[PDB]
Design a protein around this ligand. Structure first.
Ligand SMILES: *[C@@H]1O[C@H](CO)[C@@H](O[C@@H]2O[C@H](CO)[C@@H](O[C@@H]3O[C@H](CO)[C@@H](O)[C@H](O[C@H]4O[C@H](CO)[C@@H](O)[C@H](O)[C@@H]4O)[C@@H]3O)[C@H](O)[C@H]2NC(C)=O)[C@H](O)[C@H]1NC(C)=O
Ligand SMILES: *[C@@H]1O[C@H](CO)[C@@H](O[C@@H]2O[C@H](CO)[C@@H](O[C@@H]3O[C@H](CO)[C@@H](O)[C@H](O[C@H]4O[C@H](CO)[C@@H](O)[C@H](O)[C@@H]4O)[C@@H]3O)[C@H](O)[C@H]2NC(C)=O)[C@H](O)[C@H]1NC(C)=O
Lengths: 99, 42, 50
């Protein structure tokens, strides 16, 4: 929040592919502005493009200091992916008893 | 008068929006029965 | 005109002759208009920004 304040945007406007995903503020170690959307195909218009190895969730964020924009449009083309293979194990030891 | 006009710089709705529309609502008035010219200041 | 509408009032006269002798006919007619209306350009607008 401090960085964007210095950038000259008094109040920033957080918008995904859908406007209902308006961002909010939260504090963990500093003043942060953040947006939260599920990891699924389209609840906030997030595209799922899955290849044989990974599946990524792609959506774009929009930055502005006003409801209307007149110059320097901002497009945060973000996407994070997940693999489809993984290794898991019980954490309890087993000890069989036999005759 | 019977015609109203105004001009403004072009903008864009910040967001996933690419088209802009305009909608005005008009109210006629009597040129004599009341004062129609509106004046505002900050 | 009242606050909301303005009406135009006039009366019509019916007769089969220049002079009337019975059953005078008066058609009291008037149609009105509101003072508010909604308009929307039929032209789509598309901005282009950096
Ligand atoms: C199936 O889809 C997956 C998911 O996208 C894809 O894996 C991706 O591979 C590409 C191609 O290499 C990676 O693209 C990145 O491109 C630049 C360099 O050109 C860098 O950002 C990345 O390298 C970084 O790797 C590490 C990441 O921290 C660091 O060592 C360092 O930052 C490097 O710069 C990378 O090359 C993309 O990141 C991956 N995504 C992953 C691994 O999650 C996969 O290739 C696709 N399979 C196909 C098309 O067969
Ligand atoms: C300002 O003046 C305007 C113009 O006269 C006025 O609107 C009028 O309101 C009156 C009162 O309601 C209407 O009088 C009519 O009276 C009879 C029933 O008593 C009916 O003819 C009308 O109802 C009809 O409404 C619809 C018309 O098609 C139909 O559903 C159907 O025919 C109904 O019967 C109506 O009540 C008069 O018609 C209106 N004029 C309109 C609607 O153009 C307004 O109320 C005044 N405002 C004030 C005094 O603040």
């Amino acid at each position: 929040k401090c960085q964007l304040k210095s950038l000259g945007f008094d109040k920033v406007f957080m918008y995904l592919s859908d406007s209902r995903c308006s961002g909010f503020n939260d504090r963990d170690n500093r003043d942060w502005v953040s947006v939260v959307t599920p990891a699924r195909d389209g609840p906030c218009g997030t595209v799922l493009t899955r290849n044989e190895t990974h599946a990524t969730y792609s959506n774009t964020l929009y930055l502005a200091d006003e409801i209307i924009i007149r110059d320097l449009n901002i497009k945060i083309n973000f996407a994070c992916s997940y693999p489809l293979d993984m290794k898991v194990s019980l954490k309890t030891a087993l000890q069989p008893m036999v005759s | 008068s019977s015609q109203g006009r105004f001009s403004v710089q072009m903008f864009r709705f910040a967001g996933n929006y690419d088209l802009v529309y305009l909608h005005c609502e008009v109210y006629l008035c009597d040129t004599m029965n009341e004062k129609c010219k509106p004046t505002c200041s900050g």
